[PDB]
mmCIF file of C-alpha atoms in Angstrom:
data_model
loop_
_atom_site.group_PDB
_atom_site.id
_atom_site.type_symbol
_atom_site.label_atom_id
_atom_site.label_comp_id
_atom_site.label_asym_id
_atom_site.label_seq_id
_atom_site.Cartn_x
_atom_site.Cartn_y
_atom_site.Cartn_z
ATOM 1 C CA UNK H 77 -72.544 -72.064 -22.233
ATOM 2 C CA UNK H 78 -69.407 -71.166 -24.024
ATOM 3 C CA UNK H 79 -68.045 -74.627 -23.615
ATOM 4 C CA UNK H 80 -71.250 -76.123 -25.116
ATOM 5 C CA UNK H 81 -70.949 -73.684 -27.882
ATOM 6 C CA UNK H 82 -67.431 -74.988 -28.681
ATOM 7 C CA UNK H 83 -68.722 -78.548 -28.286
ATOM 8 C CA UNK H 84 -71.458 -77.713 -30.744
ATOM 9 C CA UNK H 85 -69.070 -76.387 -33.419
ATOM 10 C CA UNK H 86 -66.937 -79.357 -32.868
ATOM 11 C CA UNK H 87 -69.933 -81.702 -33.541
ATOM 12 C CA UNK H 88 -71.029 -79.703 -36.568
ATOM 13 C CA UNK H 89 -67.625 -79.881 -38.212
ATOM 14 C CA UNK H 90 -67.592 -83.532 -37.581
ATOM 15 C CA UNK H 91 -70.226 -86.235 -38.557
ATOM 16 C CA UNK H 92 -74.540 -82.336 -39.820
ATOM 17 C CA UNK H 93 -74.567 -79.604 -42.401
ATOM 18 C CA UNK H 94 -72.333 -76.514 -41.847
ATOM 19 C CA UNK H 95 -73.745 -73.332 -43.353
ATOM 20 C CA UNK H 96 -73.769 -69.937 -41.636
ATOM 21 C CA UNK H 97 -73.050 -66.203 -41.405
ATOM 22 C CA UNK H 98 -73.269 -64.184 -38.143
ATOM 23 C CA UNK H 99 -71.323 -62.402 -35.431
ATOM 24 C CA UNK H 100 -71.349 -65.099 -32.816
ATOM 25 C CA UNK H 101 -74.387 -67.375 -33.586
ATOM 26 C CA UNK H 102 -73.755 -70.923 -34.939
ATOM 27 C CA UNK H 103 -75.969 -72.265 -37.587
ATOM 28 C CA UNK H 104 -76.535 -75.925 -38.626
ATOM 29 C CA UNK H 105 -78.298 -76.588 -41.884
ATOM 30 C CA UNK H 106 -80.039 -79.884 -41.099
ATOM 31 C CA UNK H 107 -83.322 -80.293 -42.994
ATOM 32 C CA UNK H 108 -86.585 -79.505 -41.215
ATOM 33 C CA UNK H 109 -85.753 -76.085 -39.640
ATOM 34 C CA UNK H 110 -81.977 -75.480 -39.934
ATOM 35 C CA UNK H 111 -80.962 -74.305 -36.441
ATOM 36 C CA UNK H 112 -79.040 -71.300 -35.150
ATOM 37 C CA UNK H 113 -77.878 -71.172 -31.473
ATOM 38 C CA UNK H 114 -76.418 -68.301 -29.639
ATOM 39 C CA UNK H 115 -76.480 -66.796 -26.113
ATOM 40 C CA UNK H 116 -79.242 -64.467 -25.117
ATOM 41 C CA UNK H 117 -79.062 -60.689 -24.955
ATOM 42 C CA UNK H 118 -81.068 -59.976 -21.816
ATOM 43 C CA UNK H 119 -78.977 -62.319 -19.591
ATOM 44 C CA UNK H 120 -75.869 -63.269 -21.072
ATOM 45 C CA UNK H 121 -75.874 -66.522 -19.087
ATOM 46 C CA UNK H 122 -77.902 -68.937 -21.231
ATOM 47 C CA UNK H 123 -77.704 -70.426 -24.765
ATOM 48 C CA UNK H 124 -80.875 -70.403 -26.937
ATOM 49 C CA UNK H 125 -81.888 -71.668 -30.237
ATOM 50 C CA UNK H 126 -84.016 -70.401 -33.232
ATOM 51 C CA UNK H 127 -84.861 -73.108 -35.770
ATOM 52 C CA UNK H 128 -95.385 -75.480 -34.832
ATOM 53 C CA UNK H 129 -95.537 -74.250 -31.260
ATOM 54 C CA UNK H 130 -94.217 -77.715 -30.462
ATOM 55 C CA UNK H 131 -90.835 -76.295 -31.858
ATOM 56 C CA UNK H 132 -91.126 -73.372 -29.287
ATOM 57 C CA UNK H 133 -91.440 -76.070 -26.649
ATOM 58 C CA UNK H 134 -88.447 -77.887 -28.291
ATOM 59 C CA UNK H 135 -86.150 -74.743 -27.979
ATOM 60 C CA UNK H 136 -87.173 -74.398 -24.358
ATOM 61 C CA UNK H 137 -86.397 -78.039 -23.781
ATOM 62 C CA UNK H 138 -82.941 -77.522 -25.361
ATOM 63 C CA UNK H 139 -82.480 -74.510 -23.004
ATOM 64 C CA UNK H 140 -83.376 -76.326 -19.782
ATOM 65 C CA UNK H 141 -82.181 -79.915 -20.586
ATOM 66 C CA UNK H 142 -79.548 -79.824 -23.331
ATOM 67 C CA UNK H 143 -77.566 -76.568 -22.711
ATOM 68 C CA UNK H 144 -77.741 -77.151 -18.909
ATOM 69 C CA UNK H 145 -75.950 -77.088 -15.668
ATOM 70 C CA UNK H 146 -73.874 -80.249 -15.997
ATOM 71 C CA UNK H 147 -72.611 -79.177 -19.363
ATOM 72 C CA UNK H 148 -71.625 -82.661 -20.577
ATOM 73 C CA UNK H 149 -70.901 -83.342 -24.333
ATOM 74 C CA UNK H 150 -72.976 -86.424 -24.811
ATOM 75 C CA UNK H 151 -76.360 -84.874 -24.131
ATOM 76 C CA UNK H 152 -75.584 -82.216 -26.880
ATOM 77 C CA UNK H 153 -74.532 -85.256 -28.966
ATOM 78 C CA UNK H 154 -77.926 -86.858 -28.342
ATOM 79 C CA UNK H 155 -79.990 -83.762 -29.020
ATOM 80 C CA UNK H 156 -78.083 -82.640 -32.223
ATOM 81 C CA UNK H 157 -77.661 -86.108 -33.617
ATOM 82 C CA UNK H 158 -81.419 -86.406 -33.154
ATOM 83 C CA UNK H 159 -81.758 -83.379 -35.480
ATOM 84 C CA UNK H 160 -88.971 -86.350 -39.738
ATOM 85 C CA UNK H 161 -92.324 -86.822 -38.085
ATOM 86 C CA UNK H 162 -89.898 -87.598 -35.141
ATOM 87 C CA UNK H 163 -90.114 -83.793 -34.829
ATOM 88 C CA UNK H 164 -93.856 -84.099 -33.922
ATOM 89 C CA UNK H 165 -93.459 -87.158 -31.837
ATOM 90 C CA UNK H 166 -90.452 -85.976 -29.988
ATOM 91 C CA UNK H 167 -91.822 -82.514 -29.314
ATOM 92 C CA UNK H 168 -95.001 -84.167 -27.994
ATOM 93 C CA UNK H 169 -92.977 -86.184 -25.546
ATOM 94 C CA UNK H 170 -91.006 -82.913 -24.740
ATOM 95 C CA UNK H 171 -94.056 -81.032 -23.980
ATOM 96 C CA UNK H 172 -94.891 -83.946 -21.754
ATOM 97 C CA UNK H 173 -91.458 -83.728 -20.003
ATOM 98 C CA UNK H 174 -91.862 -79.991 -19.702
ATOM 99 C CA UNK H 175 -95.359 -80.081 -18.402
ATOM 100 C CA UNK H 176 -95.483 -83.422 -16.517
ATOM 101 C CA UNK H 177 -86.931 -86.983 -20.058
ATOM 102 C CA UNK H 178 -83.489 -87.665 -21.540
ATOM 103 C CA UNK H 179 -85.361 -89.472 -24.334
ATOM 104 C CA UNK H 180 -87.367 -88.271 -27.373
ATOM 105 C CA UNK H 181 -89.951 -89.943 -29.534
ATOM 106 C CA UNK H 182 -90.589 -90.856 -33.198
ATOM 107 C CA UNK H 183 -93.738 -92.411 -34.481
ATOM 108 C CA UNK H 184 -93.789 -96.141 -35.744
ATOM 109 C CA UNK H 185 -97.387 -95.194 -36.796
ATOM 110 C CA UNK H 186 -98.355 -91.564 -37.028
ATOM 111 C CA UNK H 187 -98.862 -91.681 -33.310
ATOM 112 C CA UNK H 188 -96.809 -91.032 -30.224
ATOM 113 C CA UNK H 189 -99.338 -92.064 -27.619
ATOM 114 C CA UNK H 190 -98.936 -92.475 -23.695
ATOM 115 C CA UNK H 191 -97.444 -95.805 -24.590
ATOM 116 C CA UNK H 192 -96.773 -96.973 -28.161
ATOM 117 C CA UNK H 193 -94.309 -94.916 -30.122
ATOM 118 C CA UNK H 194 -91.022 -95.557 -31.847
ATOM 119 C CA UNK H 195 -89.148 -93.931 -29.010
ATOM 120 C CA UNK H 196 -85.332 -93.389 -29.375
ATOM 121 C CA UNK H 197 -82.269 -91.837 -27.576
ATOM 122 C CA UNK H 198 -78.573 -91.466 -27.677
ATOM 123 C CA UNK H 199 -77.626 -92.655 -24.270
ATOM 124 C CA UNK H 200 -75.458 -91.520 -21.378
ATOM 125 C CA UNK H 201 -72.205 -93.571 -22.103
ATOM 126 C CA UNK H 202 -73.297 -94.778 -25.544
ATOM 127 C CA UNK H 203 -74.831 -91.793 -27.521
ATOM 128 C CA UNK H 204 -76.407 -93.816 -30.320
ATOM 129 C CA UNK H 205 -80.060 -94.513 -31.433
ATOM 130 C CA UNK H 206 -81.594 -96.704 -28.761
ATOM 131 C CA UNK H 207 -85.250 -97.643 -28.760
ATOM 132 C CA UNK H 208 -88.418 -98.235 -26.818
ATOM 133 C CA UNK H 209 -90.971 -100.053 -28.993
#
């Protein structure tokens, strides 16, 4: 968790928007819900974000899939470089991947169906916007 936190600050001081004030939490001022990630206070063993219940599903997806047990940098690159109706489409695909994966959705229309969205990712060895359409 601490090494993902350091990777996150290294990402934010390279390439999104860097505005914050806290004790430990890191805040990233990307538009459509500027984010703030920190470890939990009940267990100290897990990172967590605070950034429309699709977004709650998005923070649980970040907790189980992004800040997660391999702790590799490029998945953090993928999720953070991802972060505007792509929010709705992605979190629909993420409530899918929570209920029913390494990819998120954007809408070529206003829709992210079973098929047929503008699906994107930032891949394993690549980490750049790659598509299913």
